[PDB]
Design a protein around this ligand. Structure first.
Ligand SMILES: [Cl-]
Ligand SMILES: [Cl-]
Ligand SMILES: [Cl-]
Ligand SMILES: [Cs+]
Ligand SMILES: [Cs+]
Ligand SMILES: [Cs+]
Ligand SMILES: [Cs+]
Ligand SMILES: [Cs+]
Ligand SMILES: [Cs+]
Ligand SMILES: [Cs+]
Ligand SMILES: [Cs+]
Ligand SMILES: [Cs+]
Ligand SMILES: [Cs+]
Ligand SMILES: [Cs+]
Ligand SMILES: [Cs+]
Ligand SMILES: [Cs+]
Ligand SMILES: [Cs+]
Ligand SMILES: [Cs+]
Length: 129
């Protein structure tokens, strides 16, 4: 599913992302935009052979199981396919773990390069919420 921005913001809010570990909802929406363009079915293979899945491009090296990533851990205890669901619960639950791992949202390189320090509130501007 391709979410609308206000639509996604609300679903993130519904699932407790808003200001989770101190990251305003704008941050999570901005990260989603640049990771997946709000597409739950997004996949992208990494140079190291792992693959990133879903709205927030969660990687199969550490977080989810895909069966083809040697050395990986499945720390979210989830098949990577569950991260492509139209329901964002699994992605959200797994992102809470990631953002708690010690480096905050810097875990998402695109966040650091494209959202960090910017006017992230624009991403939720006008949204009912
Ligand atoms: Cl947009
Ligand atoms: Cl294996
Ligand atoms: Cl932090
Ligand atoms: Cs919260
Ligand atoms: Cs909040
Ligand atoms: Cs790409
Ligand atoms: Cs790629
Ligand atoms: Cs990637
Ligand atoms: Cs990547
Ligand atoms: Cs990515
Ligand atoms: Cs495995
Ligand atoms: Cs593994
Ligand atoms: Cs595990
Ligand atoms: Cs789980
Ligand atoms: Cs850690
Ligand atoms: Cs870490
Ligand atoms: Cs990373
Ligand atoms: Cs800035």
């Amino acid at each position: 599913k391709v979410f609308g921005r206000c639509e996604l913001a609300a679903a993130m809010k519904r699932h407790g992302l808003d200001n989770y570990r101190g990251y305003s909802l704008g941050n999570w929406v901005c990260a989603a935009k640049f990771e997946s363009n709000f597409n739950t079915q997004a996949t992208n293979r990494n140079t190291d052979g792992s693959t990133d899945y879903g709205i927030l491009q969660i990687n199969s090296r550490w977080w989810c199981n895909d069966g083809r990533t040697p050395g990986s851990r499945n720390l979210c205890n989830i098949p990577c396919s569950a991260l492509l669901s139209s329901d964002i619960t699994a992605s959200v639950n797994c992102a809470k773990k990631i953002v708690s791992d010690g480096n905050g949202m810097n875990a998402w390189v695109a966040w650091r390069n494209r959202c960090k320090g910017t006017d992230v509130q624009a991403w939720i501007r006008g949204c009912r919420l």
